[PDB]
Tab-separated table of C-alpha atoms in Angstrom:
chain	number	residue	atom	x	y	z
Z	142	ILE	CA	100.101	45.074	87.939
Z	143	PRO	CA	103.071	44.346	90.228
Z	144	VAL	CA	102.814	41.997	93.198
Z	145	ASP	CA	101.163	43.359	96.349
Z	146	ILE	CA	103.635	42.182	99.002
Z	147	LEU	CA	101.405	43.213	101.915
Z	148	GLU	CA	98.179	41.353	101.010
Z	149	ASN	CA	99.857	37.937	101.377
Z	150	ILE	CA	100.605	38.609	105.097
Z	151	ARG	CA	96.881	38.747	106.155
Z	152	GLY	CA	96.893	35.457	108.106
Z	153	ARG	CA	100.249	35.623	109.922
Z	154	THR	CA	101.195	36.745	113.410
Z	155	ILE	CA	102.137	40.206	112.152
Z	156	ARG	CA	104.561	41.030	115.025
Z	157	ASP	CA	107.017	38.474	113.634
Z	158	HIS	CA	106.938	39.769	110.045
Z	159	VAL	CA	106.707	43.576	110.083
Z	160	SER	CA	110.349	43.513	111.191
Z	161	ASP	CA	111.132	42.227	107.676
Z	162	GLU	CA	112.924	45.088	105.928
Z	163	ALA	CA	111.171	44.672	102.560
Z	164	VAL	CA	107.790	44.990	104.325
Z	165	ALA	CA	108.697	48.117	106.341
Z	166	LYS	CA	109.862	50.050	103.256
Z	167	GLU	CA	106.629	49.167	101.423
Z	168	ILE	CA	104.441	50.334	104.338
Z	169	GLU	CA	106.520	53.530	104.590
Z	170	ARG	CA	105.966	54.297	100.888
Z	171	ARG	CA	102.213	53.641	100.992
Z	172	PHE	CA	101.541	55.739	104.113
Z	173	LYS	CA	103.211	58.781	102.511
Z	174	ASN	CA	101.018	58.236	99.437
Z	175	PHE	CA	97.958	58.060	101.740
Z	176	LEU	CA	98.904	61.342	103.438
Z	177	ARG	CA	99.447	63.108	100.121
Z	178	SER	CA	96.428	61.816	98.185
Z	179	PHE	CA	93.427	60.916	100.409
Z	180	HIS	CA	90.120	62.586	99.493
Z	181	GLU	CA	87.106	62.703	101.786
Z	182	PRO	CA	84.051	61.491	99.794
Z	183	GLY	CA	82.070	64.361	98.344
Z	184	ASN	CA	85.049	66.681	98.932
Z	185	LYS	CA	87.810	67.930	96.634
Z	186	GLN	CA	90.441	68.784	99.277
Z	187	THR	CA	93.491	66.825	100.444
Z	188	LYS	CA	92.459	66.568	104.091
Z	189	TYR	CA	95.748	65.708	105.759
Z	190	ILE	CA	97.764	68.253	103.739
Z	191	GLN	CA	95.305	70.903	104.997
Z	192	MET	CA	95.789	69.523	108.527
Z	193	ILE	CA	99.606	69.723	108.202
Z	194	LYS	CA	99.273	73.356	107.038
Z	195	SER	CA	97.153	74.310	110.057
Z	196	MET	CA	99.554	72.350	112.309
Z	197	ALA	CA	102.577	74.247	110.953
Z	198	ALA	CA	100.736	77.545	111.488
Z	199	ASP	CA	100.624	76.771	115.242
Z	200	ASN	CA	104.102	75.083	115.381
Z	201	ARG	CA	102.687	71.846	116.814
Z	202	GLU	CA	104.435	68.494	116.369
Z	203	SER	CA	101.729	65.803	116.413
Z	204	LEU	CA	99.162	64.920	113.758
Z	205	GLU	CA	95.820	63.153	114.249
Z	206	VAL	CA	94.766	60.454	111.751
Z	207	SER	CA	91.326	58.804	111.618
Z	208	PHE	CA	91.088	55.000	111.628
Z	209	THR	CA	87.934	55.286	109.491
Z	210	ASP	CA	89.995	57.049	106.811
Z	211	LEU	CA	92.676	54.359	107.100
Z	212	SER	CA	90.123	51.538	106.758
Z	213	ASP	CA	87.954	52.962	103.948
Z	214	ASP	CA	88.368	51.771	100.345
Z	215	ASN	CA	90.469	54.833	99.454
Z	216	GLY	CA	92.712	54.334	102.501
Z	217	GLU	CA	95.107	51.435	103.114
Z	218	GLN	CA	93.219	48.479	104.558
Z	219	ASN	CA	96.391	46.395	104.983
Z	220	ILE	CA	97.815	49.069	107.325
Z	221	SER	CA	94.460	49.266	109.148
Z	222	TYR	CA	94.577	45.467	109.526
Z	223	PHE	CA	98.170	45.362	110.795
Z	224	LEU	CA	97.964	48.311	113.210
Z	225	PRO	CA	96.037	46.865	116.248
Z	226	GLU	CA	98.205	43.703	116.120
Z	227	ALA	CA	101.708	45.272	116.275
Z	228	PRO	CA	101.350	48.925	117.379
Z	229	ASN	CA	104.890	49.419	118.768
Z	230	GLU	CA	106.443	48.438	115.443
Z	231	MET	CA	103.810	50.120	113.258
Z	232	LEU	CA	103.602	53.569	114.901
Z	233	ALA	CA	107.375	54.092	114.499
Z	234	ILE	CA	107.143	53.610	110.708
Z	235	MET	CA	104.174	55.985	110.517
Z	236	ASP	CA	106.066	58.612	112.578
Z	237	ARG	CA	109.049	58.362	110.191
Z	238	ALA	CA	106.799	58.732	107.123
Z	239	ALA	CA	104.916	61.723	108.590
Z	240	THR	CA	108.213	63.459	109.447
Z	241	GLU	CA	109.457	63.017	105.867
Z	242	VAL	CA	106.208	64.461	104.462
Z	243	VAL	CA	106.321	67.547	106.746
Z	244	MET	CA	110.029	68.336	106.183
Z	245	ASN	CA	109.564	68.759	102.406
Z	246	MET	CA	106.655	71.208	102.608
Z	247	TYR	CA	108.338	73.205	105.398
Z	248	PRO	CA	112.170	73.086	105.394
Z	249	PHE	CA	112.352	75.418	108.422
Z	250	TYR	CA	110.691	72.822	110.697
Z	251	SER	CA	114.059	71.325	111.716
Z	252	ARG	CA	114.484	74.466	113.843
B	288	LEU	CA	109.342	91.362	116.112
B	289	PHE	CA	105.725	90.178	116.551
B	290	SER	CA	104.698	93.333	118.443
B	291	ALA	CA	106.667	95.456	115.965
B	292	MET	CA	104.794	93.885	113.032
B	293	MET	CA	101.308	94.088	114.551
B	294	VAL	CA	101.255	97.938	114.768
B	295	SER	CA	102.789	98.735	111.354
B	296	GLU	CA	100.640	99.983	108.471
B	297	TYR	CA	101.842	97.392	105.926
B	298	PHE	CA	101.220	94.179	107.856
B	299	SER	CA	97.969	95.501	109.378
B	300	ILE	CA	96.554	96.265	105.920
B	301	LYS	CA	97.835	92.941	104.537
B	302	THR	CA	96.427	90.775	107.347
B	303	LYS	CA	93.359	92.978	108.192
B	304	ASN	CA	94.070	92.514	111.889
B	305	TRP	CA	91.336	94.883	113.081
B	306	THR	CA	88.962	92.031	112.131
B	307	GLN	CA	88.615	88.670	113.881
B	308	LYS	CA	90.771	86.705	111.402
B	309	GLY	CA	93.972	88.716	111.999
B	310	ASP	CA	95.765	86.300	114.351
B	311	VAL	CA	95.136	83.343	112.004
B	312	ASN	CA	96.289	85.437	109.020
B	313	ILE	CA	99.589	86.513	110.602
B	314	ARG	CA	100.315	82.952	111.850
B	315	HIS	CA	99.809	81.595	108.316
B	316	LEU	CA	101.966	84.416	106.888
B	317	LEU	CA	104.844	83.608	109.267
B	318	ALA	CA	104.532	79.915	108.357
B	319	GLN	CA	104.784	80.812	104.650
B	320	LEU	CA	107.810	83.071	105.193
B	321	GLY	CA	109.613	80.427	107.252
B	322	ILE	CA	110.034	82.087	110.653
B	323	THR	CA	109.184	80.465	113.979
B	324	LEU	CA	106.771	81.976	116.499
B	325	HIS	CA	109.363	81.752	119.291
B	326	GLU	CA	111.845	83.736	117.171
B	327	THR	CA	109.249	86.460	116.647
B	328	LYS	CA	108.142	86.532	120.297
B	329	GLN	CA	111.456	86.646	122.128
B	330	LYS	CA	113.349	89.943	122.388
B	331	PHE	CA	115.250	90.756	119.187
B	332	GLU	CA	118.555	91.283	121.022
B	333	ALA	CA	118.504	87.655	122.225
B	334	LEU	CA	118.935	86.043	118.801
B	335	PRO	CA	122.296	84.893	117.392
B	336	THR	CA	123.801	87.063	114.663
B	337	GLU	CA	123.411	84.684	111.689
B	338	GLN	CA	119.796	83.970	112.690
B	339	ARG	CA	119.159	87.743	112.870
B	340	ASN	CA	120.672	88.278	109.412
B	341	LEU	CA	118.530	85.484	107.912
B	342	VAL	CA	115.279	86.820	109.439
B	343	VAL	CA	116.045	90.426	108.390
B	344	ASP	CA	116.782	89.261	104.808
B	345	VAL	CA	113.429	87.415	104.624
B	346	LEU	CA	111.379	90.346	105.943
B	347	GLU	CA	113.232	92.904	103.775
B	348	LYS	CA	112.460	90.827	100.673
B	349	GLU	CA	108.839	90.535	101.820
B	350	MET	CA	108.298	94.267	102.396
B	351	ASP	CA	110.121	95.104	99.098
B	352	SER	CA	111.207	98.691	99.701
B	353	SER	CA	114.278	100.722	98.757
B	354	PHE	CA	114.880	102.236	102.207
B	355	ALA	CA	118.429	102.809	103.462
B	356	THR	CA	119.811	104.806	106.379
B	357	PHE	CA	122.808	105.654	108.573
B	358	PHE	CA	124.164	103.758	111.585
B	359	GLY	CA	126.411	105.114	114.329
B	360	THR	CA	128.818	103.047	116.432
B	361	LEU	CA	131.033	103.931	119.393
B	362	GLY	CA	133.369	101.427	121.055
B	363	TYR	CA	131.832	98.244	122.437
B	364	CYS	CA	128.452	99.955	122.884
B	365	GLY	CA	125.306	99.024	120.995
B	366	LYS	CA	124.682	100.214	117.452
B	367	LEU	CA	121.988	102.852	116.899
B	368	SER	CA	119.803	103.907	113.976
B	369	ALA	CA	119.189	107.518	112.933
B	370	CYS	CA	115.495	106.778	112.277
B	371	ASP	CA	114.992	105.511	115.854
B	372	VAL	CA	116.836	108.503	117.350
B	373	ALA	CA	114.644	110.791	115.194
B	374	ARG	CA	111.463	109.250	116.657
B	375	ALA	CA	112.773	109.621	120.236
B	376	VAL	CA	113.759	113.290	119.711
B	377	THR	CA	110.387	114.103	118.069
B	378	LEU	CA	108.334	112.591	120.884
B	379	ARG	CA	110.390	114.366	123.547
B	380	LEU	CA	109.952	117.685	121.715
B	381	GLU	CA	106.233	117.594	120.994
B	382	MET	CA	104.639	116.051	124.132
B	383	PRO	CA	103.050	116.633	126.673
B	384	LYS	CA	101.464	120.059	126.031
B	385	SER	CA	101.141	120.715	129.789
B	386	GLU	CA	104.920	121.235	129.975
B	387	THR	CA	106.508	124.543	129.029
B	388	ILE	CA	108.025	125.078	125.590
B	389	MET	CA	111.602	125.670	126.794
B	390	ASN	CA	111.499	122.535	128.969
B	391	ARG	CA	110.396	120.460	125.958
B	392	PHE	CA	113.191	122.049	123.871
B	393	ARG	CA	115.812	121.193	126.520
B	394	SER	CA	114.482	117.614	126.800
B	395	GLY	CA	114.868	117.098	123.045
B	396	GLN	CA	118.385	118.577	123.214
B	397	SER	CA	119.358	116.140	126.001
B	398	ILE	CA	117.978	113.117	124.092
B	399	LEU	CA	119.895	114.142	120.944
B	400	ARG	CA	123.157	114.501	122.890
B	401	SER	CA	122.655	111.085	124.549
B	402	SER	CA	123.090	109.242	121.218
B	403	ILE	CA	126.769	110.196	120.700
B	404	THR	CA	128.160	108.893	123.983
B	405	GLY	CA	128.779	105.513	125.575
B	406	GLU	CA	127.913	106.592	129.115
B	407	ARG	CA	125.690	104.204	131.080
B	408	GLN	CA	123.205	106.756	132.470
B	409	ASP	CA	122.750	108.477	129.085
B	410	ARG	CA	122.147	105.185	127.254
B	411	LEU	CA	119.728	104.167	130.038
B	412	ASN	CA	117.734	107.393	129.503
B	413	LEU	CA	117.648	106.691	125.749
B	414	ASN	CA	116.442	103.098	126.231
B	415	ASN	CA	113.698	104.211	128.653
B	416	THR	CA	112.563	106.735	126.010
B	417	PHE	CA	112.444	103.919	123.421
B	418	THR	CA	110.589	101.436	125.607
B	419	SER	CA	107.817	103.703	126.934
B	420	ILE	CA	106.469	106.526	124.785
B	421	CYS	CA	107.622	105.387	121.330
B	422	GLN	CA	105.772	102.089	121.812
B	423	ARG	CA	102.729	103.766	123.401
B	424	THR	CA	102.270	106.287	120.550
B	425	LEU	CA	102.189	103.541	117.883
B	426	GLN	CA	99.717	101.496	119.946
B	427	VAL	CA	97.348	104.463	120.501
B	428	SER	CA	97.398	105.357	116.771
B	429	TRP	CA	96.593	101.750	115.790
B	430	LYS	CA	93.744	101.643	118.342
B	431	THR	CA	92.287	104.852	116.858
B	432	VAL	CA	92.260	103.411	113.311
B	433	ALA	CA	90.846	100.047	114.484
B	434	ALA	CA	88.000	101.673	116.450
B	435	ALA	CA	87.189	103.914	113.454
B	436	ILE	CA	86.837	100.967	111.046
B	437	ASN	CA	85.042	98.650	113.484
B	438	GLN	CA	82.416	101.191	114.589
B	439	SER	CA	82.017	102.904	111.153
B	440	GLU	CA	82.939	106.429	112.222
B	441	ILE	CA	83.894	107.495	108.682
B	442	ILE	CA	80.972	108.766	106.584
B	443	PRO	CA	80.630	110.429	103.157
B	444	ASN	CA	79.638	114.094	103.298
B	445	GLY	CA	79.467	115.107	99.651
B	446	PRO	CA	82.858	115.680	98.012
B	447	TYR	CA	84.823	114.457	101.065
B	448	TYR	CA	84.809	111.903	103.877
B	449	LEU	CA	84.362	112.923	107.521
B	450	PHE	CA	85.648	111.299	110.726
B	451	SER	CA	84.654	112.249	114.274
B	452	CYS	CA	85.119	110.694	117.715
B	453	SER	CA	83.052	110.309	120.822
B	454	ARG	CA	86.274	110.527	122.869
B	455	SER	CA	89.980	110.766	122.102
B	456	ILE	CA	92.101	108.016	123.650
B	457	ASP	CA	94.935	110.295	124.838
B	458	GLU	CA	94.642	114.088	124.629
B	459	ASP	CA	98.360	114.711	125.205
B	460	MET	CA	98.998	113.120	121.794
B	461	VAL	CA	96.214	114.869	119.819
B	462	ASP	CA	98.092	118.165	119.392
B	463	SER	CA	101.237	116.536	117.914
B	464	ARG	CA	101.894	116.921	114.172
B	465	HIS	CA	103.625	113.501	114.086
B	466	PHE	CA	100.601	111.766	115.655
B	467	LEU	CA	98.031	113.620	113.514
B	468	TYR	CA	99.759	113.119	110.149
B	469	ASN	CA	100.633	109.446	110.769
B	470	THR	CA	97.181	108.526	112.141
B	471	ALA	CA	95.197	110.229	109.368
B	472	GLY	CA	97.409	108.807	106.595
B	473	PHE	CA	97.015	105.310	108.061
B	474	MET	CA	93.244	105.747	108.507
B	475	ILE	CA	92.387	106.708	104.914
B	476	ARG	CA	94.231	103.732	103.369
B	477	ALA	CA	92.784	101.322	105.950
B	478	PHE	CA	89.276	102.600	105.140
B	479	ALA	CA	89.859	102.411	101.385
B	480	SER	CA	91.159	98.828	101.510
B	481	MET	CA	87.807	97.444	102.735
B	482	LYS	CA	85.722	98.283	99.651
B	483	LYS	CA	86.277	99.409	96.063
B	484	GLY	CA	85.746	102.924	94.740
B	485	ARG	CA	86.953	104.858	97.805
B	486	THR	CA	90.142	106.344	96.322
B	487	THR	CA	88.900	109.610	94.781
B	488	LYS	CA	88.009	111.867	97.755
B	489	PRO	CA	89.901	113.511	100.635
B	490	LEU	CA	89.414	112.670	104.310
B	491	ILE	CA	88.752	115.220	107.077
B	492	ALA	CA	89.283	114.218	110.722
B	493	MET	CA	88.137	115.886	113.956
B	494	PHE	CA	89.256	115.160	117.545
B	495	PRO	CA	87.762	116.672	120.731
B	496	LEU	CA	89.564	118.202	123.703
B	497	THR	CA	88.546	118.340	127.376
B	498	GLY	CA	89.668	120.035	130.580
B	499	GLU	CA	91.317	123.429	130.082
B	500	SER	CA	90.399	123.269	126.365
B	501	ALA	CA	86.867	121.918	126.829
B	502	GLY	CA	84.606	122.935	123.970
B	503	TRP	CA	87.278	122.849	121.243
B	504	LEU	CA	88.179	120.545	118.349
B	505	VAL	CA	91.420	119.882	116.451
B	506	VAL	CA	90.885	119.550	112.683
B	507	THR	CA	93.169	118.229	109.896
B	508	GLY	CA	92.947	116.402	106.561
B	509	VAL	CA	94.618	114.210	103.900
B	510	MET	CA	94.629	114.286	100.057
B	511	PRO	CA	92.908	111.546	97.968
B	512	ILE	CA	94.752	108.274	97.381
B	513	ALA	CA	94.299	108.390	93.590
B	514	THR	CA	96.216	111.701	93.223
B	515	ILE	CA	99.139	111.750	90.785
B	516	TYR	CA	102.198	113.880	91.494
B	517	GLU	CA	104.018	115.299	88.458
B	518	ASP	CA	107.316	114.908	90.350
B	519	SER	CA	108.502	113.870	93.815
B	520	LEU	CA	107.324	116.983	95.686
B	521	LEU	CA	103.970	115.849	97.293
B	522	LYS	CA	101.907	119.028	96.972
B	523	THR	CA	98.727	119.460	99.047
B	524	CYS	CA	95.862	121.979	99.128
B	525	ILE	CA	93.747	121.129	102.203
B	526	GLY	CA	95.406	123.779	104.380
B	527	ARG	CA	94.553	126.269	101.629
B	528	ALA	CA	90.951	124.988	101.729
B	529	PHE	CA	90.778	125.553	105.518
B	530	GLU	CA	92.298	129.029	105.069
B	531	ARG	CA	89.676	129.964	102.471
B	532	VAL	CA	86.924	128.626	104.773
B	533	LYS	CA	88.172	131.168	107.354
B	534	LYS	CA	87.469	134.128	105.018
B	535	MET	CA	83.696	133.501	104.789
B	536	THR	CA	81.081	135.758	106.429
B	537	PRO	CA	79.669	135.693	109.210
B	538	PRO	CA	82.957	134.651	110.869
B	539	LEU	CA	83.573	131.388	112.687
B	540	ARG	CA	85.586	130.725	115.841
B	541	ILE	CA	88.717	129.320	114.188
B	542	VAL	CA	92.236	129.540	115.648
B	543	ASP	CA	94.964	129.540	112.968
B	544	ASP	CA	98.169	130.230	114.915
B	545	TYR	CA	100.247	127.171	113.913
B	546	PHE	CA	103.042	127.298	111.353
B	547	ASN	CA	101.374	124.360	109.554
B	548	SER	CA	98.304	125.436	107.604
B	549	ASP	CA	96.476	122.068	107.555
B	550	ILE	CA	95.963	121.922	111.345
B	551	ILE	CA	93.435	124.275	112.989
B	552	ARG	CA	91.420	124.638	116.185
B	553	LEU	CA	87.640	125.057	115.950
B	554	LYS	CA	84.931	125.891	118.479
B	555	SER	CA	82.568	122.952	119.085
B	556	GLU	CA	79.449	125.032	118.360
B	557	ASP	CA	80.580	126.039	114.841
B	558	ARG	CA	80.978	122.417	113.637
B	559	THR	CA	77.801	122.349	111.503
B	560	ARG	CA	78.494	125.690	109.801
B	561	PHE	CA	82.126	124.619	109.300
B	562	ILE	CA	80.986	121.409	107.551
B	563	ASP	CA	78.660	123.403	105.272
B	564	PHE	CA	81.343	126.030	104.515
B	565	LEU	CA	84.010	123.411	103.733
B	566	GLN	CA	81.540	121.605	101.464
B	567	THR	CA	80.928	124.963	99.737
B	568	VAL	CA	84.689	125.388	99.167
B	569	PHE	CA	85.202	121.854	97.801
B	570	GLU	CA	82.093	122.139	95.601
B	571	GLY	CA	83.193	125.564	94.328
B	572	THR	CA	86.517	124.051	93.321
B	573	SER	CA	84.644	121.129	91.746
B	574	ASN	CA	82.707	123.652	89.617
C-alpha cells in the first residue's frame, strides 16, 4: 500500500497547503476516480456517469454532486473534509477534473 | 435540420416520436452522433461550409443509403437539387382540386421553368413554394399517421387491415396520388413496428370528403411488408382486387375514372357491402 498523502493533512489550516502542487494533483486524480466509479448502495449503476449522459443530452454545462456521496465510505472523505475549509481553491480543481472527464466521453463538447 | 428530421419516416420509426418519449429519444440520438442542438435548430444556410460537410457526412453514414442525384448551378446563385424541384412541381400540379386543370398545368410549367434561371422574382417564387406547401404536406401526413397509431384506428378485418377516419385533416390533399401513396406506405410500417406478427397482410385506407363531395370516400391500399419481389419491378395487385370487386352483383356506387387503378371513389352508404365484397375477393384468392 503506497502512502496516502492526503490523510496526513487532517489537522492543518488547509488553505495554506492545498496550494502545494503535489497535493492538488492527487486530489485531481481521486475526484476523477470518484466520478467514474461511485456506486449508490443497493444499486448497480454509475450514478454520475448517468448524470453526465443526461447533461450532454440537454447541452448543459454544470453538474450537481451530493455532499453525502462525497462523505460516505465509498466517496472521498478527505475531499469532503477539505472542501468547507478552502472552497475557492477546492472548487477550481473539481471543475478541472469534471471537464477532463466530460471531454473524453464526448469529444464534440468543445464546440 | 431538426424539423426536417422530425417528419421523416426513418427517424420517426427509430425514435417512436408519436409516443411521449420521442423528444428524449432524439436528444439522446443527437448526443450519440455528436451534433449540437443549436446546429440542428438554426437555419441550414447559416452554417459554415466545413461544419455543413461534417454534419452531412455523419447523417449520411447514420442513414446508410445508396442514394445519389443531380445538382444544377448557375452563376453566383444558390445550388438546387432535382429531388426538391420534383416535389415543388408535383405539389403545384396536383393541388388544390378547386382550381381548373389547365391552371394547375400552367402553374407546374412556371415552377419548372423557374429552376433554370437566376432571376430574383423567379427564385423568390420557388423559395415561397418550398417554404409553404412542401413543409405543410409533410406535416399533415405525419399528423395523420400519429393520430392513427395513438387512437388505434387500424383494425384487423379478416385477411386485411382497415383504416378509417372521423375527419380528414385537409381535404385539398386527400385526392393527391403523392399524398395518398406516401401516407399509406408510412402508416403500414409505423403500425407494424409497434408489435410483432403484423407483416403478412395488406392495409386498406379510407378518407371522407365533405362539401361539394359530401357523402363520398376515397379508397386506396398497400401490399404486405413481408412480400418478396423476384426482381426490382415492385408489382402490386390491390388495384386489380378493387377492379374485381366492381364486377360483383348487385352493383355498388364506385367511380373508377382515374388512370391509377388502386385509387377509387366510393359512396358512403355502400361501405359495409364493399368491406364484405373485398373480404370475399381476398378470401377467394386465399382459397
